[PDB]
């Protein structure tokens, strides 16, 4: 039944170019439908857009619905997806929920709208929402969440500190300039809310220029603030960049080392050997060639061997470091000198 | 757990063989060589590092009990075993070939006896184009 | 008296979720009281805010005051805090000073205000000031100060250089454009103060746009300035990010290595052995089995052993590096070849 | 014929100062001609510029045309460029196409224009286009493309995510503020196009200030957006900087190690030895001192040796890492202990 | 004559706090005089400033002049500064030229001005120029220049590329919007000069907002430009930060390793031994215990030893790396196995 | 390919020398020492690492066939050889000196027999001021 | 300090044992083996690296005096000892258990004599639920 | 330079001792042991690495000539020597003490004969409070 897995990997785990050409095409179709929705807002072009967004909509719903059904049937190539309950587990994950919501809500809106302005008010958001459909495996999102989690302390730190500096400096500016009137006669810093607004738009280096301080006190404080606080709203860029880079690079350098394969073999083998231990009449007992107490000790050794293999494999899943070098050099030199002494005794 | 610690004290006596209460590398290698195994020194060292929590270099009886106490049917060990199979999975669909598995068991890592593999294969429903679902083996050998 | 340490670690060194839920709740309460203070500024909502900030204020002062007393009593679980003088040392540290000031000043303002606009003028700052209460151990601040101290030279450097470039380029622009009149008829660059203002808001990439150069000379200089000087007000972000990251990562990778434990044991043991040395009738003298001069040499050896352990432990407190590898390889190879020669002689 | 290679390396692979002085001079000439073209736009100076851009143009076309012909003749010093077809391959590469287009189009425009305003409309772009002529080997572009390719996943990721955040937050702002009227009476956020404009100019930290949100909902969303999304349009700077740095540094540290030379020698030597293997009457057969089956085994060994040398050299082309250390330590210690056992047996 | 070196290191190589307090004080005095000069520009305070800048000026000139003479006399503690010519070499370096110019020009302006508005027009620049006096050793500038030189290729690259993108995109915008009229009726993009201005202020993320594109073509191009080009004017920050950090850190980690001391000893010793070689009747010839040809071979060996020591010391001046580990492991293992074979032969 | 696999089975028999079907390090070093070569252990190890894809440490017959099957006239091997010459090229023009090449062959790496070099030089048009185009050698020895 | 340097010259004579004025690794290992200690070579090396400031590999008499001259009751050594205890502190409250401390002393690091530990425990007020304040020990053994 | 290359061919003959034209590690260690020096293998290796530019492991006669040809009075070697002194300079003023220098020469690195140091000190004007300007020594021993 190779057809099933074939179309699966064509749809879910794409490689090559034909796959890529397909997914890129679908991306272009969804972007194009979006930009028609963009042009639905402009009063100059709400004429054509509203009309052409009726044909495209039904085309896309039949497309993606057919596609979803094919996909859901093809998922059975996996092992945890076979069975009705397997399928129901396959629809449980997020992106499939997204696809289902989009298609079903498209059907609802198109069937109510033909016989309705709130329709299009919904269509625009659905067109916006379909973009989630591109990432077929959530690799981007998983990467981000990982790297954010690793660096949670740094980010909480800079967030806290920049927050405080914003609060305090903006209060001080508010006190300084609640009376200051703009050249146009209006008061920019009426309230602490507006000072907070100014502070946010300043500290992060945007500077619309809609609120400016006038008095020497405010300018002094704004200078110190803008010079010493902005750098806390710009750390995350560097942190996240380093994290993304290192994450990806380790994830692709681990595509090379092959000791993972023997270690995995060893792990599986000792695990099943341990399981064979419990049953008394297992055949594996013949490996030692009557069993007064041997049951115990054999179980002990095999148990240990299992946990040893477990940890060796686990540590093999990670890159190398200086600790490995130091420890192995120690062990080797020690075993060496032990043998040196053994021979130095053999001379007697 | 009184019968449990009884059996564990019994089992610990077989390794202790005296009134020390601690297990040395030699003290374990002797027991193993009685079984005709011939382990390496570093192997016994690795075995004994992953039992003791004091760092001294031997296994106290509470450490022995701690080892025995924790369970193989674990939330993490299940995942480790499952992720170990996937190294040998082509296309990652959750199935592997009969002959491929037989080849991996008898050749790689601690090579198995052929009859042990003959037992292993027949534990699972092997029919259906020769493929086998390895999560079945996982649930089996994690049932304890 | 486990109750004491229990509530301590519930309040001061929190872990789990119940602790976290509590601290998060308290954070929400203080943020919420702040934003009511924010709305006290807006003339539309100074009615409700001033009123509701009377009930909440007394609720919070009784809350945090009770909390502080419980905390100060529970501190005795520590060893340097037992005793009245221990407590008085516990209140001496900064964050406790903060908490005390907030509660006491709250009591003062609420008791004067009920029988008073300067009151609320103070309340807003106290609400702002309570946010310090969140960090229970100053981890954020300690981290920042550490990383800043490490990189003090780089930061002084970039500060100095960007400062100079600002001064000189802004003077040149002032000379260029003291005559230039805006389209609205006013002169932006009246004084060198305003050119400095423009320079600060430019070099740091904000750009309110309230001051702009008009003449070709000013635009030329501003281009060169903005292209070549801005990068000195943006180094600190990268520096601080790298520092935070590395600091945290080392601080959590050191949670693993266990040679610290034997080294600490060794240190304590040789230290107390050295102290046992001085007293002549110590029992420890029996370890060697009459003392003509042995006093001296034993003290010498034990003294040395102490300083050896001291430095070994100290170096064990830090991560690994290539120096370790090189030195230990040298030592091992040398000891090896020495034994090789010893045996090569044994053959004779 | 050393003249040929001499002028080649003077023009194509420059070193020293005289070369550098020449190329720098040519750069100044092209920049100067550009800035005259700049001044051709200003109505105050379209008089002089249009006139002086007639003499300079013919000077430059004769200059660069003579230069191109000299260059194309001098290219024969290389080996893949000798022959008419070699030359035709030399003109096939991009930068030569650029040079040819510039000179030829200059000839066309100058000959049509003398006997024509569309002329100068073309001249400005050609002056702009000549700047490509500076990089004689495309080192900048090759570097960029390399480093971009390496980090393609990270960049696609941040692009995708920042794109989505832009789309969604800008839609939300549009809903919030399609009714909001500016102080000047006009509506900034008329359409979703304008909200997208605002979003682009905001998220990337420019902030012209031509579009601002007025309503508390918009300001809230803009705050969260500007604080949490901007950092995705600023990752590429850090990523690309690290990549450029590391790329260059490895490319210049590899100027030192010399094991590449023996490995290259070995590679070439075993390759030609393998080729000598096929011909039966090769002289190399005398190296072994009749050939019943020796043909086979010799071919087998030499084949293997070739692929061994291939991979050794390939791996020698790259910098060092911890893997090398670990593997070689293992191998050495193992070979050692093998010899230890061999001798321990020799004692019997 | 320890007084001389004492005051030298008090003035030139300061350490401690008293030194630091002095230099910090002098910095405050110069900053304060500057800010009076700042207030000389403001018409409200040109009264006091011009007056008080007469007393302070003479105070400072006598201060810094006395200071310079003391300094120049104290420089003789060094060895290359003793002698009149040594002093004349000491005044030759930049910062001393700066100090001399400031004091002398101060004398000139104060003596012409008392018996003169161009005076103060000069004073402001001299006050600005005195800030160079702070860095007593040019450590900041030397650091910057070093790190810039190391990363010259990357910076030239990004400069070139961002330059090109600016030129081309700004031309395209100019073509798009030479007709576009602002809401106020004026044409922003009159000339390509103004488009270049807009491009500079955009690409670098300032955004004054004085020039904005109106037409959909311009907005499209500006979006692509601002999203894909800005990151080239922000690389230098990350590059320079990494460079500063690494530079400083290596410069302070090299304060620890002590093999530099034996290597330096060895170097000096073999150098002078080589020099002792030439003179026939040197005493050093007795080290070997008649000289038929021994002259030659001894000179050969000593020459080699010198260059060996030279390179060993040179390499000792730098930090460690993996190359060291690999090479030394190889050498040690090889020497080992050689001795293994030697003994394996000794058994016969 | 039946005659091809016939010859490859024949050739594999010379290394196997028994009914194992796998080639050990010793099992290859013996064959080589029969030719009077005297390789190092690590040399045979490196030879045998770059044949097997199982990681076990010997050459199965399919691995032997995989080795024989792939081609020297390759898109990548051509580039590798061409880029190997350039290490010895002064000015990178695509030409090298006769005497220089003779010196490099007879001294560096696995030193060649002089007469082998005499054969090598005359394969290419060596005249024309003594220079030689090495891409000619590349196309020659990549013609197979 | 004349009696101090007198005693230090006396003590240095016991290690010197001749007119060298420098102490070699062997020259110290002999003295220690007279006490029946049997140190390792690297141990004596580490002992002797942390005395000399010349880097030559022996202890001059001024270096010996520098060692003796500096004090144990130090601002930094106090902190080091205090921070060494905290490795063994559960909950970091500044208290540790009696039995725990006895276990750590007699087992980890340079194992102590039991009676030495019996002396150690009774130096401090051990009562009060068996807990002990270790800063007391710090102040004691840093009193000199 | 004909007498120069004559003397260099003469000197090279003393190391060659046969018609090889290359110098081996042994081939140099023999000459040195004739002088009663006893160098280490790695020492001769380091000596010989910094002569050859071919990487083969011996010294051709042109390499020997290249060594002899380049000069000690160099723009860079002067700076290296000057910067080597500064390691031992307190306060960096360009002066060092007489006794300090005598101590450094006779103890650190390749220890000198005392009379050699007695020659060294008197080459420079040592008077003037015992200080000495080491740039004088630099200019002297870089005068060749
Ligand atoms: C151009 O050269 C530079 C530029 C900047 C630095 C640098 C290092 S640490 C740093 N800021 C800071 O460490 C924090 C904290 C100290 C004050 C300045 N900022 S605060 O405004 O956010 C701020 C303000 C007020 C409150 C209540 C909390 C937070 N600024 C170093 C060198
Ligand atoms: C886009 O590609 C780029 C962009 C920038 C660089 C780069 C490296 S170093 C550097 N600036 C600098 O090194 C400093 C110093 C030299 C002039 C420019 N800046 S200054 O204005 O602060 C400045 C101006 C005037 C004064 C008195 C002090 C300081 N700019 C490299 C590549
Ligand atoms: K901005
Ligand atoms: K703006
Ligand atoms: K910005
Ligand atoms: K702006």
Tab-separated table of N, CA and C in Angstrom, chain E residues 162 286 302:
chain	number	residue	atom	x	y	z
E	162	UNK	N	25.244	48.064	1.569
E	162	UNK	CA	24.220	48.994	1.974
E	162	UNK	C	24.262	50.253	1.152
E	286	UNK	N	84.564	28.630	27.312
E	286	UNK	CA	84.905	27.635	28.322
E	286	UNK	C	83.737	26.736	28.697
E	302	UNK	N	73.771	27.643	17.938
E	302	UNK	CA	73.289	28.749	18.746
E	302	UNK	C	72.321	29.613	17.961
